[PDB]
PDB file of C-alpha atoms in Angstrom:
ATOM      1  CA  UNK A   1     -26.396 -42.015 -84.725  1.00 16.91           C
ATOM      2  CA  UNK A   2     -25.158 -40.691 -81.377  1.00 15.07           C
ATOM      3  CA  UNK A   3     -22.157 -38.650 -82.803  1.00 13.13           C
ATOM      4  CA  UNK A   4     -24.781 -36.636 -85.152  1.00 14.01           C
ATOM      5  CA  UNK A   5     -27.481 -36.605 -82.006  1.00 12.38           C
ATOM      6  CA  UNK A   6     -24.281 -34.859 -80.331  1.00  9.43           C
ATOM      7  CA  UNK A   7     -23.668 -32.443 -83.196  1.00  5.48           C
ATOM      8  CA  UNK A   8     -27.023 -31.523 -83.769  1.00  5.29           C
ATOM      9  CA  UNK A   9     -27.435 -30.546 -80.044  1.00  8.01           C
ATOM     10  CA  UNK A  10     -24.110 -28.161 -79.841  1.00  6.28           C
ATOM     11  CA  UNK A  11     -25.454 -26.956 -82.980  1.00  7.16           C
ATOM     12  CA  UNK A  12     -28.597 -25.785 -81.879  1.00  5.27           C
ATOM     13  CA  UNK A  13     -27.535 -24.383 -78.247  1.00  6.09           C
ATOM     14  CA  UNK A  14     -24.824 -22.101 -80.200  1.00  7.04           C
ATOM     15  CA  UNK A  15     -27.002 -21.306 -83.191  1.00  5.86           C
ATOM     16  CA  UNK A  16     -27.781 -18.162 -81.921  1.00  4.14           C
ATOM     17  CA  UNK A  17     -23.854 -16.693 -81.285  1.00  6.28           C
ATOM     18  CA  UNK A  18     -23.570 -17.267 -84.774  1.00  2.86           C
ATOM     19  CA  UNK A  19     -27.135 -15.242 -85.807  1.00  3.42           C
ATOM     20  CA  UNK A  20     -26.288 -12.517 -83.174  1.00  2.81           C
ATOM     21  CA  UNK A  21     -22.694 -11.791 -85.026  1.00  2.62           C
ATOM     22  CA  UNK A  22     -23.923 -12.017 -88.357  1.00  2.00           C
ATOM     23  CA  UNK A  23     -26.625  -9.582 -87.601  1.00  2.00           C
ATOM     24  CA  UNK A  24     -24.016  -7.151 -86.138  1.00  2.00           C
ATOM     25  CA  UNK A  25     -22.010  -7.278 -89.093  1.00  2.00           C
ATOM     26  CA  UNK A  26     -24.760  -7.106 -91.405  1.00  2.00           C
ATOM     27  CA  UNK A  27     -25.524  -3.761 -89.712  1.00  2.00           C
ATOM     28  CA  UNK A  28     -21.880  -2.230 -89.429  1.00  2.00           C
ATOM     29  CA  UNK A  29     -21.198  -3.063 -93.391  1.00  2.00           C
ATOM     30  CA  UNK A  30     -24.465  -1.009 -93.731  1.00  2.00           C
ATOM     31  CA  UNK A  31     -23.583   2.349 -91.446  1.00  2.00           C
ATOM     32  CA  UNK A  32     -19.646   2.157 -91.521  1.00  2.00           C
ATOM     33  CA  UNK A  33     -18.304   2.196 -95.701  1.00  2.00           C
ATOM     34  CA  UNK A  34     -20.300   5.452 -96.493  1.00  2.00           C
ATOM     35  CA  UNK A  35     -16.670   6.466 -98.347  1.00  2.45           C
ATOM     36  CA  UNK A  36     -18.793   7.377-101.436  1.00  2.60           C
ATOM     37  CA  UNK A  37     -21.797   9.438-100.115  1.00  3.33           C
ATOM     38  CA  UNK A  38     -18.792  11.195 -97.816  1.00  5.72           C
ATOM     39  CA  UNK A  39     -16.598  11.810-100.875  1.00  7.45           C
ATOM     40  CA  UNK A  40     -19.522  13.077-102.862  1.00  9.13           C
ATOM     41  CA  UNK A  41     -21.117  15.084-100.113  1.00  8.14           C
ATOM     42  CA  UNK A  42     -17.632  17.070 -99.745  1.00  9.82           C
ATOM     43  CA  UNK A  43     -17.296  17.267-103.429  1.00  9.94           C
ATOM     44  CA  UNK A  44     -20.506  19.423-103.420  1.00 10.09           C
ATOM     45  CA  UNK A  45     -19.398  21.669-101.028  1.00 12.24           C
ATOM     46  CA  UNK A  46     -15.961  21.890-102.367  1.00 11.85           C
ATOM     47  CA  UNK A  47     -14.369  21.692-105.704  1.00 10.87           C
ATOM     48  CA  UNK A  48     -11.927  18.998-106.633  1.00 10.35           C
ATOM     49  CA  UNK A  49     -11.998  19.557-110.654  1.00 12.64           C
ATOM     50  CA  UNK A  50      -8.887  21.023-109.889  1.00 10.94           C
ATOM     51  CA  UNK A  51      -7.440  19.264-107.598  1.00 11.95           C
ATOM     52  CA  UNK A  52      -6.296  19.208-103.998  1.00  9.42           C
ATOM     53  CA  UNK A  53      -4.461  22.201-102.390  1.00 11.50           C
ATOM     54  CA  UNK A  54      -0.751  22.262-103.145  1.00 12.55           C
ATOM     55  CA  UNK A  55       0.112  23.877 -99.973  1.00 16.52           C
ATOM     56  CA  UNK A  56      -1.919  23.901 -96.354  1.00 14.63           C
ATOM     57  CA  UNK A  57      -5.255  25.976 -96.803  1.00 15.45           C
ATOM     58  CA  UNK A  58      -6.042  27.348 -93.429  1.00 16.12           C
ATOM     59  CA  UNK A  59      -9.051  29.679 -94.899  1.00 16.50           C
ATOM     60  CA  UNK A  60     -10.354  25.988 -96.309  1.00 14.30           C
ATOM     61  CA  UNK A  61     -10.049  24.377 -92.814  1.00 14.27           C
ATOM     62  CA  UNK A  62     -11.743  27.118 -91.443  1.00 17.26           C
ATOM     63  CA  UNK A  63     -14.431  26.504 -94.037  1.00 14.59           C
ATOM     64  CA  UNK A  64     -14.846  22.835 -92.875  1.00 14.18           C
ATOM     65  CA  UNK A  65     -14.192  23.485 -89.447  1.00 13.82           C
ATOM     66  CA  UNK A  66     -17.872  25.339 -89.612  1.00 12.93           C
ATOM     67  CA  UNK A  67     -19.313  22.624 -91.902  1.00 15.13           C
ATOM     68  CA  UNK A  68     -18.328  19.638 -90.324  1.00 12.56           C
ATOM     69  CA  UNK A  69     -16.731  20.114 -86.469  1.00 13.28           C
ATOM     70  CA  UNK A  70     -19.947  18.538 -84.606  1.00 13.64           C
ATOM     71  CA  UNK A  71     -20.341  15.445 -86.786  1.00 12.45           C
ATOM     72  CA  UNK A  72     -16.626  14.590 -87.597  1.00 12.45           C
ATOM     73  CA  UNK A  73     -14.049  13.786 -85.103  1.00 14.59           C
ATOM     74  CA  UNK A  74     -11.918  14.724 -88.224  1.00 14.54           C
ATOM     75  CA  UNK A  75     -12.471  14.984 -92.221  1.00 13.69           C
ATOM     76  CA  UNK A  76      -9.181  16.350 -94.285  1.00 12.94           C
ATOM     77  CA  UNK A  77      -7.839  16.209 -97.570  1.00 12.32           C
ATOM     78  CA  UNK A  78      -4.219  14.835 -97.717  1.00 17.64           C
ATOM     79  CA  UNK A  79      -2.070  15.627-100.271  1.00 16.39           C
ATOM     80  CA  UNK A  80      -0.164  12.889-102.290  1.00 15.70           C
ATOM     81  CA  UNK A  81       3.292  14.654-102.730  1.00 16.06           C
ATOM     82  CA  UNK A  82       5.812  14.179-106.004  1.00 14.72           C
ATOM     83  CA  UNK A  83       7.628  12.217-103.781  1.00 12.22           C
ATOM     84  CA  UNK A  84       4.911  10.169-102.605  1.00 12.71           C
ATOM     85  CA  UNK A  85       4.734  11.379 -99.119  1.00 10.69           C
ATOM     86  CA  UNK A  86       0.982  12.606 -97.852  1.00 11.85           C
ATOM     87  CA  UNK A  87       0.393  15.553 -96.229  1.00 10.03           C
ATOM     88  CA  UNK A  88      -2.367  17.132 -94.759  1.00 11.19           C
ATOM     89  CA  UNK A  89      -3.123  20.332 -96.499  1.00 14.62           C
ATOM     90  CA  UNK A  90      -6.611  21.102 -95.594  1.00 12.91           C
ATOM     91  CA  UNK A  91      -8.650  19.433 -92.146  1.00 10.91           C
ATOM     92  CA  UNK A  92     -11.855  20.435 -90.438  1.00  8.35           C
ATOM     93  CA  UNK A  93      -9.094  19.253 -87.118  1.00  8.48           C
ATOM     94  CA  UNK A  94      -6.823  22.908 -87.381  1.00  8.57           C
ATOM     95  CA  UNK A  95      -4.230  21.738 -85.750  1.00  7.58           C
ATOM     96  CA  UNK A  96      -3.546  18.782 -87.922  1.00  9.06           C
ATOM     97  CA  UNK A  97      -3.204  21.186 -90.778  1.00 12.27           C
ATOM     98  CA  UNK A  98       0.500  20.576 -92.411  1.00 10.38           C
ATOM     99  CA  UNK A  99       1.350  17.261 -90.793  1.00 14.61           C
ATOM    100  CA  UNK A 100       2.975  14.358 -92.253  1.00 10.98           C
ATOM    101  CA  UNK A 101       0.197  11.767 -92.807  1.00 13.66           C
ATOM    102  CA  UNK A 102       2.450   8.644 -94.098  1.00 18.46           C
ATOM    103  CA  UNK A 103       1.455   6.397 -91.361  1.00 17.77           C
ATOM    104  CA  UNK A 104      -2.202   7.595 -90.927  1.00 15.41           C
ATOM    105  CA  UNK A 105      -2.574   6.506 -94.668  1.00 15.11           C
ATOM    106  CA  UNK A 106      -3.098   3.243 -95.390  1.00 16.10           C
ATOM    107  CA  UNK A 107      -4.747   3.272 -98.937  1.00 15.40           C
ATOM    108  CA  UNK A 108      -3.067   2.017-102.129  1.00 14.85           C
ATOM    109  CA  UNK A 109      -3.600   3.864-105.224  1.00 18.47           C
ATOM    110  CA  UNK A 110      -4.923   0.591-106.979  1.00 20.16           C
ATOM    111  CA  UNK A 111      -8.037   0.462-104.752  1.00 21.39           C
ATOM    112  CA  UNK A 112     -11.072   3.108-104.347  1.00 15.60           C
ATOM    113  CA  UNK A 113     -11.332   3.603-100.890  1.00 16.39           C
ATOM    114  CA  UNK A 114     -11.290   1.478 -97.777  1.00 16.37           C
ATOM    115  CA  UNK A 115     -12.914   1.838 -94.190  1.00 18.52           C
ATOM    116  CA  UNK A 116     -11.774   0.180 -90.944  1.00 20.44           C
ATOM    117  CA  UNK A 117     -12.134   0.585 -86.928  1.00 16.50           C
ATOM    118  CA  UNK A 118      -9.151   2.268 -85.050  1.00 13.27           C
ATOM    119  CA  UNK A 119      -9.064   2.740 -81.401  1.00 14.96           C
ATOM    120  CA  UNK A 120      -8.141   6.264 -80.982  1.00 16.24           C
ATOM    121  CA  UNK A 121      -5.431   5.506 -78.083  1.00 14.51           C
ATOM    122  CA  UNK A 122      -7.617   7.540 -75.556  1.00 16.44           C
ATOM    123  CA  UNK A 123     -10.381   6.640 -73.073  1.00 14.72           C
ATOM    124  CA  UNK A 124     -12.711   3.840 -75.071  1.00 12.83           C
ATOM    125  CA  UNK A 125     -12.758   5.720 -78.163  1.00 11.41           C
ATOM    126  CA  UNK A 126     -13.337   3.631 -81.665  1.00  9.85           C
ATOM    127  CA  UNK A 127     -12.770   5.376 -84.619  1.00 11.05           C
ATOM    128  CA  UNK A 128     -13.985   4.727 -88.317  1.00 13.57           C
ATOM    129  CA  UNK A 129     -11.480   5.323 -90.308  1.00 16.29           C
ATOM    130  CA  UNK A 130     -12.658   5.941 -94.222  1.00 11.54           C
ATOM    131  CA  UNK A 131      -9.537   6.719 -96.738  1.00 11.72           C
ATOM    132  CA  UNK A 132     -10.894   7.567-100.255  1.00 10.74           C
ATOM    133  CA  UNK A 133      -8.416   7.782-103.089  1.00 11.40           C
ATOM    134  CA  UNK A 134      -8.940  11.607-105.074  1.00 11.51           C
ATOM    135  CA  UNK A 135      -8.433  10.718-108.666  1.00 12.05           C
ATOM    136  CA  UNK A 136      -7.393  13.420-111.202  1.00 12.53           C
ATOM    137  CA  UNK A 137     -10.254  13.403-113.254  1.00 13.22           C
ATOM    138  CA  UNK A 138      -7.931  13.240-116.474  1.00 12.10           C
ATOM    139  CA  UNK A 139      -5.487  11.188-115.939  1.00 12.83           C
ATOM    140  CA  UNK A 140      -6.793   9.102-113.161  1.00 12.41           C
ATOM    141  CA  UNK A 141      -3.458   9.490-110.725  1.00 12.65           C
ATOM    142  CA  UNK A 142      -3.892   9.443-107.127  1.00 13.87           C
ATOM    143  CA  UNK A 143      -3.852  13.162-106.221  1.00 17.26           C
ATOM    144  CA  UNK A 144      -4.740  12.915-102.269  1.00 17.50           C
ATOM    145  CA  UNK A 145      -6.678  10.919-100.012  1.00 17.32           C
ATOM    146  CA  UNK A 146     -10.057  11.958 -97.976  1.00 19.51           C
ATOM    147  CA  UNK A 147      -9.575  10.834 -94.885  1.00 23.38           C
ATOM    148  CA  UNK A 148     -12.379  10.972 -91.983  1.00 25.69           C
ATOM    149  CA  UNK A 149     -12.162   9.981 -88.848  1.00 27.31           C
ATOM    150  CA  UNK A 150     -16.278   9.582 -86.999  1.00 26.76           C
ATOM    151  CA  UNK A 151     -17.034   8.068 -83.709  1.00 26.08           C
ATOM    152  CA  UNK A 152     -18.371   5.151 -83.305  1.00 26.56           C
ATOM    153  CA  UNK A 153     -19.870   5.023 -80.146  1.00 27.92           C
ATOM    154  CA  UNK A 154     -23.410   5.900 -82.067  1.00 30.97           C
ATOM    155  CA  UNK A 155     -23.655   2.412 -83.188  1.00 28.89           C
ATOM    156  CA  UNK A 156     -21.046   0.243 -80.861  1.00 27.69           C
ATOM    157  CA  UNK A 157     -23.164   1.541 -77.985  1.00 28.65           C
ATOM    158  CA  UNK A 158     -26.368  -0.172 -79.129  1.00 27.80           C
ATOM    159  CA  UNK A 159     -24.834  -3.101 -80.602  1.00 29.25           C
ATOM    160  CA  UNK A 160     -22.983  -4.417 -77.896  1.00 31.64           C
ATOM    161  CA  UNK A 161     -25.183  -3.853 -75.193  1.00 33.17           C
ATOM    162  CA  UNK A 162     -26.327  -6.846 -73.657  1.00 31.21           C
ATOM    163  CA  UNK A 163     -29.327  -6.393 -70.875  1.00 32.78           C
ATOM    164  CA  UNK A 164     -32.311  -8.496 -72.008  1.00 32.23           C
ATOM    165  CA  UNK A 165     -28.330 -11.156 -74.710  1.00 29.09           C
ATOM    166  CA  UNK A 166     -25.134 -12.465 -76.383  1.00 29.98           C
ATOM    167  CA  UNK A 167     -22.391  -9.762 -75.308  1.00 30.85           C
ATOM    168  CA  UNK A 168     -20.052  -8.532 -78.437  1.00 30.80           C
ATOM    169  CA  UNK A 169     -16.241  -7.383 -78.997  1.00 31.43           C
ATOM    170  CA  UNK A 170     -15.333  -5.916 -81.839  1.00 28.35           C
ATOM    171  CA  UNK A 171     -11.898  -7.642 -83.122  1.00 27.90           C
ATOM    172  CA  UNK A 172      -8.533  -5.914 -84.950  1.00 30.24           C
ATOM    173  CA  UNK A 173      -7.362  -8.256 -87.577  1.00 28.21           C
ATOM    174  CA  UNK A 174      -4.088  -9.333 -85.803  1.00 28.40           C
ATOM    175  CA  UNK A 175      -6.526 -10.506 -82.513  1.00 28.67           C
ATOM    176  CA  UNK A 176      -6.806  -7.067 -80.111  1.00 31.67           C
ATOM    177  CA  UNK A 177      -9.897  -6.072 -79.232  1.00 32.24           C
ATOM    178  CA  UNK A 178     -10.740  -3.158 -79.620  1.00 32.55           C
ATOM    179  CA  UNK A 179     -13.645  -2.595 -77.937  1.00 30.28           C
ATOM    180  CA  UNK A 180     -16.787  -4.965 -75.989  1.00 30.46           C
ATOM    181  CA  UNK A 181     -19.550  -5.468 -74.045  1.00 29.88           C
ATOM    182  CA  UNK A 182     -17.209  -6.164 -70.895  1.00 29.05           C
ATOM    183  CA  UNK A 183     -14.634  -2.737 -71.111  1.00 30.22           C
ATOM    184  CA  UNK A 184     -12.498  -5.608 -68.601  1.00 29.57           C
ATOM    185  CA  UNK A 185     -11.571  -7.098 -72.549  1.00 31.04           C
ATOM    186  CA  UNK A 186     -10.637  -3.533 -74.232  1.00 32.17           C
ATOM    187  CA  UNK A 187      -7.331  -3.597 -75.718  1.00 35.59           C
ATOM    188  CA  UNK A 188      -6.627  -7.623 -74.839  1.00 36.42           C
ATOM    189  CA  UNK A 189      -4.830 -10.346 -76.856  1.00 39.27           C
ATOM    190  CA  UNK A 190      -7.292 -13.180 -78.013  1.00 41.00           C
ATOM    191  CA  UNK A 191      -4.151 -15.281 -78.663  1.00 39.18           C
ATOM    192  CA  UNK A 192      -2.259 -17.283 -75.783  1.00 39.22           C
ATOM    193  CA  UNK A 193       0.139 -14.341 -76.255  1.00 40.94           C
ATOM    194  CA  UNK A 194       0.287 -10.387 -76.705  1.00 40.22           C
ATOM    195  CA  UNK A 195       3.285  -9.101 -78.642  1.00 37.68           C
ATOM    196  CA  UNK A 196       3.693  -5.056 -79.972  1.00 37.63           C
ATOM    197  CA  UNK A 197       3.078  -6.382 -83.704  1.00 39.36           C
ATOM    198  CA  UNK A 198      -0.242  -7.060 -83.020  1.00 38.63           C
ATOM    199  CA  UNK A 199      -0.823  -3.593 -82.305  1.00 37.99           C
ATOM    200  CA  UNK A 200       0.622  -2.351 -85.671  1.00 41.58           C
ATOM    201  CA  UNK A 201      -3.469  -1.955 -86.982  1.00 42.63           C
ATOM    202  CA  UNK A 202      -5.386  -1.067 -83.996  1.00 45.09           C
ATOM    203  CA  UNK A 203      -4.668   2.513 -83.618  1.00 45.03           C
ATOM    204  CA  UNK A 204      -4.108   5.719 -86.061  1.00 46.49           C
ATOM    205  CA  UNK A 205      -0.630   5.081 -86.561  1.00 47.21           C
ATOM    206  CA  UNK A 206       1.344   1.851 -87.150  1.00 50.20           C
ATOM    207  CA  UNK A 207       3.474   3.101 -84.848  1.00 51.55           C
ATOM    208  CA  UNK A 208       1.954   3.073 -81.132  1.00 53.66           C
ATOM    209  CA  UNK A 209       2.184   0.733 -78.800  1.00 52.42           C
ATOM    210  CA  UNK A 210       2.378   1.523 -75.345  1.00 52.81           C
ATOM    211  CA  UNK A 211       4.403  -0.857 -73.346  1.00 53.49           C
ATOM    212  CA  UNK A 212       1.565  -1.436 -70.435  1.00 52.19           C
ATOM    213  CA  UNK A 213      -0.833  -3.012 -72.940  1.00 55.07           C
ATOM    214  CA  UNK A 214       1.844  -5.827 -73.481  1.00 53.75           C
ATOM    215  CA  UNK A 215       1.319  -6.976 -69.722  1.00 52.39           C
ATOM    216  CA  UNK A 216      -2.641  -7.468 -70.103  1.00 48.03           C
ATOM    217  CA  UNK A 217      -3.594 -11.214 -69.745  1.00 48.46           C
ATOM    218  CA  UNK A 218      -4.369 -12.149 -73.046  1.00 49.10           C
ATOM    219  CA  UNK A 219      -7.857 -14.499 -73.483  1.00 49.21           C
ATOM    220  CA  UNK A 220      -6.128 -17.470 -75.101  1.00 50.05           C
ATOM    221  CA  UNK A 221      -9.444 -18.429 -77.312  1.00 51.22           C
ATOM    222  CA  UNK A 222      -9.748 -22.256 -77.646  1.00 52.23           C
ATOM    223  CA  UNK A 223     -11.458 -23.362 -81.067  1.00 52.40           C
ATOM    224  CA  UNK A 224     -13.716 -25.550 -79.837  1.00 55.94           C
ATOM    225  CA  UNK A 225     -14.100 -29.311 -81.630  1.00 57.91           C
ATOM    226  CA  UNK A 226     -17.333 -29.023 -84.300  1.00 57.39           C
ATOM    227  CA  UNK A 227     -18.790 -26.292 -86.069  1.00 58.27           C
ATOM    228  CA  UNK A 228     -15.923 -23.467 -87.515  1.00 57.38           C
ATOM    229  CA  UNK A 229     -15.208 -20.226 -85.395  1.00 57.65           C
ATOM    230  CA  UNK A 230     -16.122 -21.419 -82.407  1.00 54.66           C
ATOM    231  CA  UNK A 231     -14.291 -20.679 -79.449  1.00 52.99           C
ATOM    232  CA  UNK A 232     -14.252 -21.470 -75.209  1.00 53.74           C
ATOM    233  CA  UNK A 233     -12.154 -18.494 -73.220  1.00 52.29           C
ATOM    234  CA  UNK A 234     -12.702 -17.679 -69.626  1.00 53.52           C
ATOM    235  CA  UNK A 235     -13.480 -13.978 -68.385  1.00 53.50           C
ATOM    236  CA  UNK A 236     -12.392 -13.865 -64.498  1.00 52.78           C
ATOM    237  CA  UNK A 237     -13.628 -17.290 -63.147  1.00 53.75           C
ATOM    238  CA  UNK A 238     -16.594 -17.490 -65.634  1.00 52.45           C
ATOM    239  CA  UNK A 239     -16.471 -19.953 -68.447  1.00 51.40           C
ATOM    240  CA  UNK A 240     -17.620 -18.474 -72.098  1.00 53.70           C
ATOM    241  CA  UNK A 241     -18.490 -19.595 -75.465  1.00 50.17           C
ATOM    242  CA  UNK A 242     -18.254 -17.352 -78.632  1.00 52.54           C
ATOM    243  CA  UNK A 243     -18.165 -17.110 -82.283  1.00 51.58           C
ATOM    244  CA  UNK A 244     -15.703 -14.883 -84.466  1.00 52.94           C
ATOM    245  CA  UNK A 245     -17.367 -13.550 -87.834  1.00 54.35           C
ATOM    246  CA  UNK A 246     -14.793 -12.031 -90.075  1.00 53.17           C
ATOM    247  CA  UNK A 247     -15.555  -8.410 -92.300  1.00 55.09           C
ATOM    248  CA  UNK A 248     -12.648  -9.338 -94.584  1.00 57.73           C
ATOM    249  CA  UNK A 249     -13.365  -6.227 -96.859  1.00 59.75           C
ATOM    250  CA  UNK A 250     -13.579  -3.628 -93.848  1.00 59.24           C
ATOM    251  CA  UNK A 251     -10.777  -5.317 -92.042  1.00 57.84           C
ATOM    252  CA  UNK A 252     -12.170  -6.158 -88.447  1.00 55.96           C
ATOM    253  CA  UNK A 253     -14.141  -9.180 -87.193  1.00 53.35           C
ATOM    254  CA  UNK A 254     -16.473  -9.732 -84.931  1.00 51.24           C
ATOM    255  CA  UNK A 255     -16.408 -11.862 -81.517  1.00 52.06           C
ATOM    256  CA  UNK A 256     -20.060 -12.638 -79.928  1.00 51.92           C
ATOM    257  CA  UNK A 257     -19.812 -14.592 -76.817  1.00 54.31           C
ATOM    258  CA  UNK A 258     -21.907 -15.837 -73.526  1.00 57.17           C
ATOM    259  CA  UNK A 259     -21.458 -17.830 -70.671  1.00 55.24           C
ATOM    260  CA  UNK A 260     -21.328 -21.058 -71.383  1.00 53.83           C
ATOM    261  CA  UNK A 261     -24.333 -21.980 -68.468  1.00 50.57           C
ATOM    262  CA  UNK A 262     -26.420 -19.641 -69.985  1.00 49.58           C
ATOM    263  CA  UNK A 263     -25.658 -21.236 -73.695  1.00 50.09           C
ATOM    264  CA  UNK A 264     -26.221 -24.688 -72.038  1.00 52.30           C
ATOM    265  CA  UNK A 265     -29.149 -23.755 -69.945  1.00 52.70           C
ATOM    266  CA  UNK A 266     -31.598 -23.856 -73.649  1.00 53.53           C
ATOM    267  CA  UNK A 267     -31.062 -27.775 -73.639  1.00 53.27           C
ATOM    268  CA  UNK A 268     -33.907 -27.345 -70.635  1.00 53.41           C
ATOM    269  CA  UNK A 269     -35.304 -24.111 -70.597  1.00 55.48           C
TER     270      UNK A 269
END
């Protein structure tokens, strides 16, 4: 029939959107949720039988300062307080030694761990963001969270490069982007509309949203008619086709796109 004919040809011409963003996630859920080699790597170096500090332990940051400044943007142990408050009491990051950590934490004391992507709120800088739960060994109670923060740039870099290419943003779960191939879409609304409570999970704290990102043109992604996630948006005057692939247990989803000539251009060439 001609309505399958039809479907079969979209099909084929977007086929490879779809392979492009499964590869990428394929590859982030293998590099980014390393909470249990990080947790166990730490555990080595330092003791937890006993717990975590019960006060700030500057000679401890010190000791991770020297261990673990050049391949962390930040690794500390936060303290779960009586009252249930977190605090930092020991961070490779000095100065964040002592600080209030209740909205950097995110982790419920029912689940292991969790990992996610942050932007860090200054020049195009994605964070990974791994929260591991410190269970008393005895009773099993949340004592403190690990918390690491690790650039991302080592693996964004190379996977949303585009020279030879679909082009790839990387997506918050609320729709901001937090980072792709064209910098132009950094920090933009897929929606028809931006609003500050999108911004709630995008950056460090749940707190942060400056007011010039609520001006930004958001891309106003149009499902398009057959097939799921697929999408039409316009960057400048150039029209684009894309897929979103969601990483429901890390979080963030994936956006590959291309111009929709180029897409078009394999029912020839």
């Amino acid at each position: 029939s001609n309505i399958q004919q039809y479907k079969k040809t979209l099909s084929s011409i977007t086929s490879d959107l779809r392979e492009n963003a499964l590869f990428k996630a394929h590859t982030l859920q293998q590099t980014i949720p390393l909470n249990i080699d990080i947790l166990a790597l730490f555990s080595e170096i330092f003791d937890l039988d006993r717990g975590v500090p019960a006060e700030p332990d500057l000679a401890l940051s010190k000791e991770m300062e020297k261990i673990f400044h050049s391949t962390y943007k930040e690794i500390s142990l936060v303290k779960k307080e009586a009252d249930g408050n977190f605090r930092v009491v020991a961070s490779s990051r000095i100065e964040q030694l002592g600080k209030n950590y209740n909205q950097e934490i995110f982790l419920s004391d029912s689940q292991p761990f969790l990992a996610t992507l942050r932007h860090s709120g200054s020049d195009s800088q994605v964070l990974a963001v791994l929260q591991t739960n410190i269970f008393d060994i005895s009773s099993q109670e949340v004592l403190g969270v690990l918390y690491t923060l690790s650039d991302t740039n080592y693996l964004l870099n190379g996977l949303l490069a585009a020279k030879d290419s679909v082009k790839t943003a990387i997506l918050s779960k609320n729709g901001i982007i937090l980072q792709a191939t064209d910098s132009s879409l950094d920090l933009v609304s897929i929606h028809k509309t931006v609003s500050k409570e999108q911004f709630c999970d995008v950056f460090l704290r749940d707190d942060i949203c400056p007011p010039h990102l609520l001006l930004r043109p958001p891309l106003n992604l149009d499902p398009l008619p057959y097939g799921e996630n697929f999408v039409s948006f316009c960057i400048g005057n150039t029209e684009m086709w894309g897929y979103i692939h969601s990483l429901p247990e890390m979080d963030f989803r994936i956006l590959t796109y291309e111009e929709k000539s180029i897409i078009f251009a394999s029912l020839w060439r």
